[PDB]
Amino acid sequence: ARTTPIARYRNIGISAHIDAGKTTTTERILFYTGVATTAFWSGMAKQYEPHRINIIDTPGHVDFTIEVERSMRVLDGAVMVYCAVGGVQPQSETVWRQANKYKVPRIAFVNKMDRMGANFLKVVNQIKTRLGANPVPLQLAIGAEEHFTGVVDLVKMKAINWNDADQGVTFEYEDIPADMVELANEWHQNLIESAAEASEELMEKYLGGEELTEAEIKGALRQRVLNNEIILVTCGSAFKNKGVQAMLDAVIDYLPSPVDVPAINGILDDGKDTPAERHASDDEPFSALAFKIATDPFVGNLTFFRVYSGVVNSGDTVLNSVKAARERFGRIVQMHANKREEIKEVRAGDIAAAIGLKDVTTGDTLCDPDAPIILERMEFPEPVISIAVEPKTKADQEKMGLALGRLAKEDPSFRVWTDEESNQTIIAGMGELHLDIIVDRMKREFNVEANVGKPQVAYRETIRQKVTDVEGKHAKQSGGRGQYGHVVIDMYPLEPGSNPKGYEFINDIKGGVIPGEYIPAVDKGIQEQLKAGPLAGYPVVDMGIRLHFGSYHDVDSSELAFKLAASIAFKEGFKKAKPVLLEPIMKVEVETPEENTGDVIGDLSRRRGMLKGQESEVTGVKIHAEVPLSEMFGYATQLRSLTKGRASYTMEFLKYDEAPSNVAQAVIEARGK
């Protein structure tokens, strides 16, 4: 029974730079349609059969662009929202590159045409010049700012005027304003020329002076959008309510259905990585991608999944091929217009959520157990900022682990580990505003009382002076039998990192002054003292010890007596050897626009960052600097402030250098206190 063709499905993302107006445009959509959300659209003139629009509203911030990446990958088409005043933003370029990576056929909506400085054609030219795109206006704005009244449809060559009294639910077709007729004819010719380029037949008609029909123009522009050759540009502004309705008609006319998109690539679970495809059909084996996990207070884990092939029912044991885990599907609903119609028939093209999946993560493939496939995996970027989180109480201690676990499950770009040296819980994320939201959820949804600090710098200990002839004599001949042990050691610094063990032991015992059986106990006594340095109780590194002189007693000498002597000798020698506190240094790489370059280093200089050099790149300059871990905290948001949000840094542990005398001494004193 032919019900609603999958060719009527529009799986679309609304994507924009932070602060551009995209969910208000979506709220306008829901109002006009009748209502991840499903909506139904029949056209602003009711000229279309009912189309199913599944909308994913993607975050504007770059701290949550990981969600945008997941969405773009799982979606068919996109609506790119631009501010008429601000135009193409640095963050728009990031989202634009992500949509290019996934080849998402997309259109453009120039919103905020009611604000001061609104300029449609300026934004069209910025899409061309900054994004390297081919923008083709479908519409022209009638007026600007407070004088924005409507739009010209360049396909129909008519003005669209929306009724302000019904919030734009009704519209009239008018003749083009007399001051715009010349400009409308110019852009109409540019639109027809852009349509004619879609095929040799349409190019011949156009060059022959034959007028293209509205159906040929629409079909030709659709083909090129699907090929990602052009971007169709629409305009309009809500509040007075304009554009959205005609942008929704452009979604029907020009954006892909699930059958217009290439088959999804995957790998067979045969151990040979055999390539396979899944076509957008109900008659194919079931395959779906889990793309979002949300924690719900009432139903537990919601796993959002997009079906690409086949059909599944609410309550169907499928196979999580990625995690090799048979997962019985839970309760599955669907946002049928306003209601949440529980669907027991998730067909190809549909987006739904399952309740109570246990071993499913974002990026997992859910498939038919009799036809295993792994759909292509999501690569998750490495976290760029880390902070220490400490529980206030012991109740908060266990609760913290639980809360952070849930947050790491729903958001892969969020990492949590315990630092083995500090025993602090370290949390890491895709920016500090990202970490701020994570902390807020932890101390609200889960209400876990925690302090936010900085990852403790891994302080080390070493000497800066050879000391010779250091006597250690454990002579405890008391309490029954005596315990005699006597060693003489030299202590000397090693070059930093010259020994992968951080420690050298030289046995230079001559004359059997110490029996060879006790020499391992002396070394073990030193190695235990290396774990807790005599200066501040940090591990001692980059040190050599030569045992060359010693003495035993035939009855009273013990293995651990010589280990006690070794510790005495070590503690006395270490204090004489001018002990110092060490530091880690981090190799930092910053990518920035050439005009923002200066600011980056100004701050890095205050952060004790020894700028090694620079590699002027295409974006601008790739500056390299040696910056202490202590000064590499809170840099994500600071960089975002200096560079207006167009810079990305990386950092790696470089080497164990010497902390500046001031820094080292200050910490030594604080630790002693």
Next chain:
Amino acid sequence: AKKVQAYVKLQVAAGMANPSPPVGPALGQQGVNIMEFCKAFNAKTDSIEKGLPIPVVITVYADRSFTFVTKTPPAAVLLKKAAGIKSGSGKPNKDKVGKISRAQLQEIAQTKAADMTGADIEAMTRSIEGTARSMGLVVED
């Protein structure tokens, strides 16, 4: 050539490749390609001997094309070439680095009068006398 707004005289070498990292300086608050440079210098490299950094300029025209201003390995690095002792700068007056004859520069001043442009071959000799003592040299026949 063009205005001094697309002016950085640079290029210590050609085989070290990229003139953007430390090796090649500048490339800051200016904006231009980097591999689009040494290819015209690749038809130009094999006349210059290495160890002799030649000053050329990234002169960018108004239509995105840029080539260089061929000069000549100059005063400074030829006294690290024709004498045989490198930079060592700072000590003209402390200890003896090297004395250079009168005619040892005049034979390469004809090469250096295509590098230095005040007037003449003889007239540029007393500025080969310049940076030599800043490198630390002394000069007498």
Next chain:
Amino acid sequence: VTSYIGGEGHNLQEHSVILIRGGRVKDLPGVRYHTVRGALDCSGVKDRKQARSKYGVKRPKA
């Protein structure tokens, strides 16, 4: 109570829902309960093909 960790190397991170079983080790006074290395936070332990039921390892590949 104080529990005991079986196997020879765990997968622990100090906040981990682990399961408890009876049994006194006779060697640590005050440790009276074993853990299960096959249940809920301790997977099939490393490098073992015999008595797989204890320490929870599944049967090997072939």
